[PDB]
């Protein structure tokens, strides 16, 4: 409703770095809000793409940002009559970024890994890897829970069970309020998908440089399955956390699996032991139900609600024709211990190929009316296909069915304006939560400041 579309703030990165692919707000130890931006095709030292991370201080004028420096050098360790190897070329560092406390977690989902032993090998595969930084102190740590030292022949003999070689850990990520990092790994277990969790503190205290293969004890991974409904389901494409079981001492995980059960798509709510509490099945095959998930209480009863994007949903139109426009589903959490029901509301895109629902950002309470609000991205929407972000306001019965405000992309064609979103943080300290919108196609980020209601 009350985001200022006249006076924007633009931050920018190098050409072709995909600056703005991921973003998040970040508070330093003193509460000062900055913007952490991932740029997964930033050039490294060898004039090859490795990705990079930028930490943008808040300035109304925007501009350039200093980089958050990570080690881009390939690593080799000869230990245990084996050779360990990391390959950071085209790893996509900054394909996801998240901030918790004064710590930034930036992940390279396509970092490759191999182990050599005489003539054999583990195979060079994208296990993924996440980099952790405490910017004010300079502390650095890594977390790569899918690296193994098992040789290729063993997986073949054991029929590729518990095969974490293609995890792409850090594809999606989220941190609990208590400081537990949860990584989505859609390629884990031969493309079923897995989750990897470990406390940030234990990641820092168990990491030393040059070990490459190390145990972090509090770590907790999800499980392989023989059920064909999970095959090629990319469980962990998106991830989120929230309170869905009634017990405030437990945190519940929300997992998107957009190709679950032969591309029907699904979203599952779990406990911290990965035991399934509910499953939201997709409505239409190939619609990519679960591409994005968002958790926020929108109707002001204190119970977290769930939003699921299906950016390729094809709407039915006259003369038996379909039109891919995208769709967003709202699930209100019922009172006490009960299953999530049918959706309370369906929001459907209008522009063909607009991909409405590609991203869903909780905004907090934008208009300060007592109900939390959301922003939905259609990165190819709008009458010109340049991209659109639509704001929907919370209300006692859920969400409004029509948007309160639409943000047309200020960038040229192809910027993918809205492919990443982040709200619910007041960056200018004016008492109103603001919205940052990534446009990696233009290598830029746009900041929308919330203003008092007119």
């Amino acid at each position, epitope marked *: 409703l009350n985001l200022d579309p006249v006076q924007l703030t633009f931050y920018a990165g190098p050409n072709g770095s995909q600056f703005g692919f991921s973003l998040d707000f970040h508070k330093d130890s003193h509460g000062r809000v900055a913007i952490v931006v991932g740029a997964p095709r930033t050039l490294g030292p060898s004039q090859e793409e490795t990705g990079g991370v930028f930490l943008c201080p808040w300035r109304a004028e925007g501009g350039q940002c200093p980089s958050l420096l990570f080690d881009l050098r390939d690593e080799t*360790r*000869n*230990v*245990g*009559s084996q050779t360990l190897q990391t390959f950071k070329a085209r790893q996509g560092l900054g394909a996801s970024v998240v901030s918790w406390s004064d710590v930034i977690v930036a992940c390279a989902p396509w970092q490759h890994w191999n182990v050599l032993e005489k003539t054999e090998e583990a195979e060079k595969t994208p296990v993924g890897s996440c980099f952790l930084a405490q910017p004010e102190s300079g502390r650095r740590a890594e977390y790569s829970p899918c690296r193994g*030292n098992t040789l290729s022949r*063993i997986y073949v003999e*054991n029929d590729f069970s518990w095969d974490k070689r293609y995890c792409e850990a850090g594809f999606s990520s989220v941190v609990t309020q208590a400081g537990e990092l949860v990584l989505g790994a859609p390629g884990g277990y031969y493309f079923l998908g897995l989750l990897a969790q470990a406390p940030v503190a234990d990641i820092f205290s*168990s990491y*030393r440089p*040059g*070990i490459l*293969l*190390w*145990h*972090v*004890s509090s770590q907790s991974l999800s499980f392989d399955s023989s059920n064909p409904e999970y095959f090629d389901g990319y469980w962990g494409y998106s991830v989120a956390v929230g309170e869905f079981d009634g017990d405030l001492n437990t945190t519940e995980y929300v997992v998107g699996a957009p190709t679950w059960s032969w591309t029907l798509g699904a979203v599952e709510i779990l406990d911290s032991y990965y035991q399934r509490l509910h499953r939201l099945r997709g409505e239409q095959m190939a619609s990519y139900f679960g591409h994005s998930v968002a958790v926020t209480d929108v109707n002001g009863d204190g119970r977290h609600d769930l939003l699921v994007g299906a950016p390729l949903y094809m709407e039915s139109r006259a003369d038996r024709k379909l039109a891919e426009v995208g769709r967003v589903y709202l699930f209100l959490q019922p009172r006490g211990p009960h299953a999530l029901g049918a959706p309370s509301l369906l929001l459907t895109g209008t522009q063909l190929y607009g991909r409405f629902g590609s991203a869903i950002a909780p905004l907090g309470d934008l208009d300060r009316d007592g109900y939390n609000d959301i922003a939905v991205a259609a990165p190819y929407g709008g009458p010109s296909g340049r991209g659109q972000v639509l704001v929907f306001l919370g209300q006692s019965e859920g969400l409004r069915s029509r948007p309160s405000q639409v943000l047309d992309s200020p960038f040229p064609t192809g910027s993918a304006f809205g492919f990443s979103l982040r709200g619910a943080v007041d960056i200018d300290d004016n008492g109103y939560p603001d919205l940052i919108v990534g446009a990696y196609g233009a290598n830029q980020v746009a900041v929308y400041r919330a203003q008092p209601v007119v």
Partner: antibody
Framework: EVQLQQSGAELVKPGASVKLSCTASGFNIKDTYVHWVKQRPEQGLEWIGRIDPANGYTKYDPKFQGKATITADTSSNTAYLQLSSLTSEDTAVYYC????????????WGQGTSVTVSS | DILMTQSPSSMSVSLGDTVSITCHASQGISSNIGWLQQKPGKSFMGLIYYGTNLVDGVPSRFSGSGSGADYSLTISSLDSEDFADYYCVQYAQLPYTFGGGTKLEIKR
């Protein structure tokens, strides 16, 4: 905490066979490698082998092939060292070891199991 | 196999001294070395892993250093409890091999 409670001291005759145990206290023995080390005053420390209790795959020093056999039961969270065709040279203290962080390290040690072969 | 020649066999020292044990390997091991402590009539305690990294709970007066095939364990300002045996162990190759041992004894 991480603790490795080994079995009590053993007293056997040459040619017999003994099975020592190493129980993981405070953690899952499936987490890391588990090694076995033999100690003698003159010969010092010698590495017998390791097992990965997650899958049961083992490694051995060729010196101990046929002599030693290492197994593990994830159920009881326990790892075992079997010694067969015992002789006087097998009279030693045996330790189970596991790393702290580094996959290939040797950081945590059991109290040791004393073995004595004699007729 | 890789031979681990640990020196010296023993040394008589006093409380507060700064002493240094060394360990020479028959070939390069790339800091894939650990340091161990065995208090008399008791089991083992890990001190160092990967050449320089302290095991959790070890005092800071312990430290490791070296590269290639020559490494050192140093104890700055000896404590009464620091009189025991110390062994190096390499894990650059299988089989793992140990050093002969070093006994720190009270000088008098």
């Amino acid at each position: 905490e991480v603790q490795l409670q080994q079995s009590g001291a053993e007293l056997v005759k040459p040619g017999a066979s003994v099975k020592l145990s190493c129980t993981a206290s405070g953690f899952n023995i499936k987490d890391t490698y588990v090694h076995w080390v033999k100690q003698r005053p003159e010969q010092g420390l010698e590495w017998i082998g390791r097992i990965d209790p997650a899958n049961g795959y083992t490694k051995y020093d060729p010196k101990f092939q046929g002599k030693a056999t290492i197994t593990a039961d994830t159920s009881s969270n326990t790892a075992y060292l079997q010694l067969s065709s015992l002789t006087s040279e097998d009279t030693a203290v045996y330790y189970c070891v596991r790393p702290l962080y580094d996959y290939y390290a040797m950081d945590y040690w059991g109290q040791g199991t004393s073995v004595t072969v004699s007729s | 196999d890789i031979l681990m020649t640990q020196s010296p066999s023993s040394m008589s020292v006093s409380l507060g001294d700064t002493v240094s044990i060394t360990c020479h390997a028959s070939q390069g091991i790339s800091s894939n070395i650990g340091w161990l402590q065995q208090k008399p009539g008791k089991s083992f305690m890990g001190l160092i892993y990967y050449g320089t990294n302290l095991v959790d709970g070890v005092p800071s007066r312990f430290s490791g250093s070296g590269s290639g095939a020559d490494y050192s364990l140093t104890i700055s300002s000896l404590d009464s409890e620091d009189f025991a045996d110390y062994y190096c162990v390499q894990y650059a190759q299988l089989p793992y091999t140990f050093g002969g041992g070093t006994k720190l004894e009270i000088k008098r």
